[PDB]
C-alpha cells in the first residue's frame, strides 16, 4: 500500500494510482500537463488570507494569481488550470485541510484530485486528453497508493499519516 516517501522529481506515474503529496510549506505542490489541452498545478495556501495577488512559478514561468483562504485554521489546496497553452489560469475545487496532505490520480480520461473539507473529503476530476502519458512534477515528498486501496488514501487525506 504505502509506497514511499519518494523525493521531488518529474516522472510519468502509472494510471489508477494515487500520488499522495506531503508538502511542508505554502506554495506550488505539484504540476502536470499534456502540452495540448490541460495544464494543472496545485497551490497550497496558508490559513486565513484575505484576497491578495501572489507570484508563483508555474511550468517554469512567473504567474500572478489572486488567492484567498477564508478559513481561520485550515489550509487550502487550490487547483489552478488552463486548457490552452496561452490561456489564463482558473481556480477550481478547493480542499480545506488540517493534515496538509493532497493526492492526484490519472484515471479514465481524467485527472482526479481531492476536494471538500477534512475530515469528510470527496474527489473531483478534470477531463484530460492523453491522460495516461501526463508527466507530473512533485515539489515535495510523495507516496504511491493503488486505486484499489483508495479507502486508505482517503483516510490519510482526512486524518494524516
Ligand atoms: C467538462 O466538464 C468537466 C470535465 O472536465 O469533465 C466536468 C468536471 O466535473 C469539472 N470539474 C470541476 C472540478 O469543476 C471540469 C472542470 O470544470 C474543467 O475541466 C476545468 O477546466 O469540467
Swiss-Prot record:
Result of changing residue 127 to A: Reduced ability to bind sialic acid
Leader sequence residues: none
Disulfide bonds: 140-153
UniProt region (Spike head), positions on chain: 2-161
Localization, UniProt: Virion
Site-annotated residues for Binding to sialic acid: 38, 127
Described function: Forms the head of the spikes and mediates the recognition of specific host cell surface glycans. It is the viral hemagglutinin and an important target of neutralizing antibodies. In sialic acid-dependent strains, VP8* binds to host cell sialic acid, most probably a ganglioside, providing the initial contact. In some other strains, VP8* mediates the attachment to histo-blood group antigens (HBGAs) for viral entry.
Protein name as annotated: Outer capsid protein VP8*
Species, as recorded: Rotavirus A (strain RVA/Monkey/United States/RRV/1975/G3P5B[3])
Residues of the full protein shown: 64 to 224 of 776
Amino acid at each position: 500500500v504505502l509506497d514511499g516517501p519518494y523525493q521531488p522529481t518529474t516522472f510519468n506515474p502509472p494510471v489508477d494510482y494515487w500520488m499522495l503529496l506531503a508538502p511542508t510549506a505554502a506554495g506550488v505542490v505539484v504540476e502536470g500537463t499534456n502540452n495540448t489541452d490541460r495544464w494543472l498545478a496545485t497551490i497550497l495556501v496558508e490559513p486565513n488570507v484575505t484576497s491578495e495577488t501572489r507570484s508563483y512559478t508555474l511550468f517554469g514561468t512567473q504567474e500572478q494569481i489572486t488567492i484567498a483562504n477564508a478559513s481561520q485554521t485550515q489550509w487550502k489546496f487550490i487547483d489552478v488550470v488552463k486548457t490552452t497553452q496561452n490561456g489564463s489560469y482558473s481556480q477550481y475545487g478547493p480542499l480545506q485541510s488540517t493534515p496538509k496532505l493532497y493526492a492526484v490520480m490519472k484515471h479514465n480520461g481524467k485527472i482526479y484530485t481531492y476536494n471538500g473539507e477534512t475530515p469528510n473529503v470527496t474527489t473531483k476530476y478534470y477531463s484530460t486528453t492523453n491522460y495516461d502519458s501526463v508527466n507530473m512534477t512533485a515539489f515535495c515528498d510523495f507516496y504511491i497508493i493503488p486505486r484499489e486501496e483508495e479507502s486508505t488514501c482517503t483516510e490519510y487525506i482526512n486524518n494524516g499519516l
